[PDB]
Design an enzyme around this catalytic site. Structure first.
Site: not given
Ligand code: HEA
Ligand code: HEA
Ligand SMILES: [Cu+2]
Lengths: 68, 504, 78, 101
Positions: B60, B90, B125, B153-154, B235, B237, B239, B250, B284-285, B310, B313, B432
């Site tokens: 999940h 294109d 995960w 892919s990414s 980390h 990922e 963002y 926006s 920080h993880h 942030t 923004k 957890r």
């Protein structure tokens, strides 16, 4: 509810006593704290009152349930 | 044939969006088992099978992180919207754009097929060794190969996006006139290119530990090195998944406020500062793994600096709504809801960034509440804001406004009453990745399980919003996709539009 | 690409601070006590104790006076 | 900036412009979100009733009464028992446990 010749109120008051353990702990702490006082001017009335007020608030409706 | 052999960016973006909806359905279904097992103390519908629960949470988490949010924002909206927005006829590499999509159904099939093999990949995960190494059989290898294919892919998509931005811009349009959605997608592509291959290297190391008897993360190796490499990927990922949401917010806020964006250069510098600071705070993880106090000291002091851009923004979004002519529709509510509820998820991150406080709430449901705020209010709200905004341009169908507000309110009620009690569970000390808890944690788990059912019903009602569309003729706009018809032609921008600077 | 707004330098001061802190942290690790590929490093107890105490004191000696003063909070909670 | 709003409003004719913050009337929204919450509650109740295979014995009423008699008291095998959580239950610092009280 059956009605008996002996008093149910002391037994109900004993049964409500585990519900107020923090008050009894505070009263015992007061009683051991003032053991060194020699002036005769130190009591433990406030904590005693708090504990017995808690016990009475627990036990008030159960007593009249057992009373005619 | 059309949907199998396509080279058009508009067909590929729609295919990404349909795929991401399918992945969202799968992760909604896997999440009702998590909340239906956790509703009451003891043993629920999983019959006390802890390995199956670990499989369910692993699949999940991976599905919702990688086959829902990224195919919706980065692959779905970016591919459909970027060439129209910058005026490109294109993409730069149209067939690379089709293999960037078609490596995702194989990865999803491998990940879903690893659950039916042996006892499944119950690792989380993050897939930490030696628990991932200790798993005997085939399931973990299929899961890691699925992650490898999705990373390829990414990377291919990011290369195509970065070349499409730099070299197919409209004549006269510099790097000052592109909308903030384009800037967000470009910065996301840069992050993907700099971050995904480190994950690929760590996963190759994991396969060589599992199957080649090598010494990367083992008895004679170092297991902290995996956490270093994985979180150096991971980390950036998170963002990657939130910057296209910022771009969509926006574009939505600027549209219905009848105003341009407040502080455009400040917005771009804030997105760039977020992109740059995301590569030096990965540890920080890893506050509880036994790092030295100087390293923990630096990673504490550098994580909180992410609050400043942030906040800039968010305050600029409020200034964009300020002194405008605001009309509140369903996409405008999903943006207002974003700005309100992303702030709640961001402030708990500042608490988690402080290491001494993190010694009490690490691997508790406090962290779960934090990242379901910044992902179910941050990315899901951004996705649904774009679905109602651009939907008649992309799909050719309009939406009923009343049922969309019913869907918004059911969703907003459901996800708030699901993850807000998990703060109180995590503060009290509920850990957890557990399916059974202490007897005193029953009340907030019952409340959260009640909220998840409302969220599921909100997912059901969303399928009823679609209806027939009304088509009109455009004259003017502030972005290029609103002077086009709905739907555009197969070759949108039949003539390449140019940007003319005013004379003297 | 554009004129850097007056905000962006105020952003760039702690960003430069974080980058310099990151570089100094990565640089000081190959000058630390447990980064020795020998057992014969520890048989000189004077030099090894001096090196490891120097690894303790730096970036912690700035905090000794407020560790002793319990300045562990923004406010003063007793 | 105004013409694109006027174009969007023409392609979305079910979106109201009647001069109020909640354009869709709340007489449409409230019964339907209530029906959704009712369906969610039906599903949650069905999970609580028909989908449990083990209800632990520490949630039975006899266990609950016998635990409420004891309170928040923890036994010790090397020492007299102690009150649990002495700050949120406001036990004084002179009292350590019930038997020592
Ligand atoms: C994108 C990220 C994402 C999203 C949306 C969600 C959505 C939900 N998640 Fe979860 N979750 C994770 C990411 C996410 N989650 C991760 C990373 C883990 C860690 C796993 C691990 O530790 O290994 C996790 C684990 C996790 C836990 C902790 C389990 C444990 O520790 O044992 C719980 C607990 O309640 C939970 C519940 C829910 C619920 C009730 C929702 C509800 O919001 C249900 C979803 C409802 C939605 C509305 C979102 C679906 C979105 C769409 C359908 C939009 C797509 C549409 C188009 C493209 C058109 N999930
Ligand atoms: C959408 C994805 C996303 C985003 C955007 C973020 C953003 C942030 N995250 Fe988080 N995070 C996750 C997804 C995300 N995170 C996931 C998935 C995990 C768990 C991983 C796992 O599975 O183990 C995690 C876990 C995680 C940890 C690890 C803790 C642990 O698990 O033990 C930490 C620690 O620093 C952290 C902090 C932050 C901070 C400081 C931000 C900042 O970027 C937020 C900054 C925003 C604000 C602060 C609010 C706006 C600012 C203002 C309104 C100005 C005013 C503010 C001040 C004056 C301070 N989060
Ligand atoms: Cu992080």
């Amino acid at each position: 509810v059956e009605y008996t010749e002996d008093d149910p109120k002391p037994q109900i008051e004993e049964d409500c006593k585990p519900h107020c353990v923090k008050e009894w702990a505070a009263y015992k702490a007061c009683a051991e704290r003032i053991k060194d006082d020699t002036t005769g001017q130190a009591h433990c009335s406030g904590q005693y009152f708090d504990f017995w007020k808690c016990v009475d608030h627990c036990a008030a409706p159960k007593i009249f349930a057992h009373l005619k | 044939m059309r949907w199998l052999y396509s080279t058009s960016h508009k067909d590929i973006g729609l295919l990404y969006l349909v795929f991401a909806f399918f992945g969202g359905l799968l992760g909604t279904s896997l999440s009702m088992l998590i909340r239906y097992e956790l509703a009451l103390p003891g043993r629920g519908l999983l019959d006390g099978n802890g390995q199956l629960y670990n499989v369910i949470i692993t699949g999940h988490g991976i599905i919702m992180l990688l086959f829902m949010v990224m195919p919706a924002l980065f692959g779905g909206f970016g591919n459909w919207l970027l060439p129209i927005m910058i005026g490109a006829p294109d993409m730069a590499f149209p067939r690379l754009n089709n293999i960037s999509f078609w490596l995702n159904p194989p990865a999803l099939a491998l990940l879903l097929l690893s659950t039916l093999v042996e006892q499944g990949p119950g690792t989380g995960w993050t897939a930490y060794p030696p628990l991932s190494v200790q798993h005997s059989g085939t399931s973990v290898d299929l899961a890691i190969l699925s992650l490898h294919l999705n990373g390829l892919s990414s990377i291919l998509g990011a290369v195509n996006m970065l070349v499409t931005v730099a070299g197919l811009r409209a004549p006269g349009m510099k790097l000052l006139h592109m909308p903030l959605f384009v800037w967000a997608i470009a910065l996301t592509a840069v992050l993907v290119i700099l971050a995904v291959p480190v994950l690929a290297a760590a996963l190759v190391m994991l396969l060589t530990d599992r199957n080649i008897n090598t010494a990367y993360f083992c008895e004679s190796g170092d297991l902290i090195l995996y956490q270093h490499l994985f979180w150096f990927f991971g980390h950036p990922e998170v963002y990657i998944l939130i910057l296209p949401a910022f771009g969509i917010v926006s574009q939505v806020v600027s549209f219905f406020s009848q105003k341009p964006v407040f502080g455009l250069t400040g917005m771009i510098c804030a997105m760039g500062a977020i992109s740059l600071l995301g590569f030096i705070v990965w540890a920080h993880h890893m506050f509880t793994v036994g790092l030295d106090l100087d390293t923990v000291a630096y990673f504490t002091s550098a994580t909180m600096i992410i609050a400043v851009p942030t906040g800039m923004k968010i305050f600029s979004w409020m200034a964009t709504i300020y002194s405008g002519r605001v009309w509140f529709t369903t996409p405008m509510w999903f943006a207002v809801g974003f700005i309100c509820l992303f702030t709640l998820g961001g402030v708990t991150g500042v608490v988690l960034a402080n290491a001494g406080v993190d010694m009490l709430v690490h691997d508790t449901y406090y962290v779960v509440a934090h990242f379901h705020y910044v992902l179910s209010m941050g990315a899901v709200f951004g996705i649904f804001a774009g679905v109602y905004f651009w939907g008649n341009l992309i799909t050719g169908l309009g939406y009923h406004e009343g049922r969309a507000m019913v869907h918004f309110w059911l969703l907003f009620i459901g996800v708030n009453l699901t993850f807000f009690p998990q703060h109180f569970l995590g503060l009290a000390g509920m850990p957890r990745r557990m399916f059974d808890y202490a007897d005193c944690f029953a009340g907030w788990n019952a409340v959260s399980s009640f909220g998840a059912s409302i969220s599921f019903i909100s997912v059901i009602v969303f399928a009823t919003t679609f209806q027939e569309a009304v088509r009109t003729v455009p004259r003017t706009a502030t972005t290029l996709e609103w002077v086009l018809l709905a739907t555009p032609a197969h070759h949108a921008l039949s003539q390449v539009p140019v940007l003319r600077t005013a004379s003297s | 690409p554009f004129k850097l707004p007056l905000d962006a330098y105020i952003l760039m001061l702690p960003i430069t601070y974080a980058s310099a802190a990151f570089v100094a942290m990565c640089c000081r690790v190959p000058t630390a006590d447990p980064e020795t590929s020998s057992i014969a490093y520890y048989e000189d107890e004077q030099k090894s104790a001096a090196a490891a105490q120097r690894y303790d004191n730096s970036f912690k000696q700035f905090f000794d006076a407020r560790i002793r003063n319990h300045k562990v909070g923004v406010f003063q909670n007793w | 900036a105004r013409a694109q709003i006027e174009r969007w409003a023409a392609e979305h004719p079910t979106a109201p412009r009647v001069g109020r913050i909640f354009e869709v009337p709340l007489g449409y929204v409230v019964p339907r979100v209530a029906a959704g919450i009712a369906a969610a509650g039906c599903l949650w109740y069905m999970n609580n009733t028909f989908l449990q295979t083990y209800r632990p014995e520490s949630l039975s009423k006899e266990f609950l009464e016998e635990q409420a008699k004891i309170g928040e008291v923890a036994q010790r095998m090397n020492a007299p028992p102690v009150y649990l959580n002495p700050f949120t239950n406001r036990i004084p610092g002179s009292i350590l446990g019930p038997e020592d009280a």
